[PDB]
Amino acid sequence: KTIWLQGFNSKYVNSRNGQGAMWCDSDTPQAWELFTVIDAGNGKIALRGNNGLYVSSENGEQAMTCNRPAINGWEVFDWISNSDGSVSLRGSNGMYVSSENGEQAITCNRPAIDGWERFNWAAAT
Amino acid sequence: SKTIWLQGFNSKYVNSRNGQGAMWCDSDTPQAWELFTVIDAGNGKIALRGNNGLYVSSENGEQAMTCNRPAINGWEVFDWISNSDGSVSLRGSNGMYVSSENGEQAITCNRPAIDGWERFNWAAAT
Ligand SMILES: OC[C@H]1O[C@@H](O)[C@H](O)[C@@H](O)[C@@H]1O
Numbered sequence: 715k716t717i718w719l720q721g722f723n724s725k726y727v728n729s730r731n732g733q734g735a736m737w738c739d740s741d742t743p744q745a746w747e748l749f750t751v752i753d754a755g756n757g758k759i760a761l762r763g764n765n766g767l768y769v770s771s772e773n774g775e776q777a778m779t780c781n782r783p784a785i786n787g788w789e790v791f792d793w794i795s796n797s798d799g800s801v802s803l804r805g806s807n808g809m810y811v812s813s814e815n816g817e818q819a820i821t822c823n824r825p826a827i828d829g830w831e832r833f834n835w836a837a838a839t
Numbered sequence: 840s841k842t843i844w845l846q847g848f849n850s851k852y853v854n855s856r857n858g859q860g861a862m863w864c865d866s867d868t869p870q871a872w873e874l875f876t877v878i879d880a881g882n883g884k885i886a887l888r889g890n891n892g893l894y895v896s897s898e899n900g901e902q903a904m905t906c907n908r909p910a911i912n913g914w915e916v917f918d919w920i921s922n923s924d925g926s927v928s929l930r931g932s933n934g935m936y937v938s939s940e941n942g943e944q945a946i947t948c949n950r951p952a953i954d955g956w957e958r959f960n961w962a963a964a965t
């Protein structure tokens with residue numbers, strides 16, 4: 715139920731404790747790198763970070779954040795299981811979550827899955 | 840923020856049934872009747888206010904639970920139990936636990952321990 719997500723740059727997705735934007739910048743999966751996968755119905759998932767708040771696509775208007783008190787939507791994603799065992803996340807605007815290779819804060823405004831939009835993942839506690 | 844859904848491990852959501860008859864854990868998706876506002880009911884306990892503005896009642900375990908009480912007394916106060924596996928359970932004032940009954944019958948509050956049907960995944964929704 716709780717997972718981490720490892721980006722194209724081998725770092726781990728970081729909630730940043732809900733302060734500012736999320737980054738794919740952590741060397742190891744610790745507390746801020748763990749997300750509870752929420753079954754939001756109709757095949758959609760949400761992600762609840764270490765702070766008990768929810769990940770938002772921000773509709774691509776700014777880098778993604780983990781600060782929402784409740785799920786609606788911008789907070790539900792398609793979980794895409796790629797052939798190589800990786801995962802991609804499709805936001806409500808139809809765009810994909812991108813690690814941006816750790817070069818900037820995580821975004822959800824790219825319309826296609828390339829390398830920066832594939833995450834390795836595992837259940838952990 | 841304080842409005843939540845409860846998903847039983849049959850993967851269905853707890854349903855207020857709009858206050859008509861007993862509550863069931865039978866909804867495929869969390870919509871209006873599946874949202875419950877968590878109300879501080881004092882002394883660390885909580886109440887659950889359903890879509891119809893009325894409160895969830897354990898009925899003291901003597902019949903299936905309902906969501907029709909206009910005000911809080913009790914059979915309407917519960918312990919919110921944070922389980923180690925990230926799920927939650929709800930302890931009625933009779934010491935028993937809310938059970939999904941695997942969706943095979945209406946929801947109950949008369950089992951004395953947390954087992955498989957008494958753990959719920961939860962999230963705050965709008
Ligand atoms: O508590 C652990 C957290 O502490 C922070 O200082 C680190 O940047 C996070 O990566 C880590 O998850």
Ligand SMILES: OC[C@H]1O[C@@H](O)[C@H](O)[C@@H](O)[C@@H]1O
Nearest residue numbers: 770782784785786787788789
């Ligand atoms: O309802 C669509 C979206 O509206 C925005 O103003 C909120 O920031 C999002 O959290 C929400 O999902």
Ligand SMILES: OC[C@H]1O[C@@H](O)[C@H](O)[C@@H](O)[C@@H]1O
Nearest residue numbers: 854866867869870871872873
């Ligand atoms: O949309 C409001 C409600 O409609 C009913 O027909 C369904 O059984 C509920 O699950 C739902 O919440």
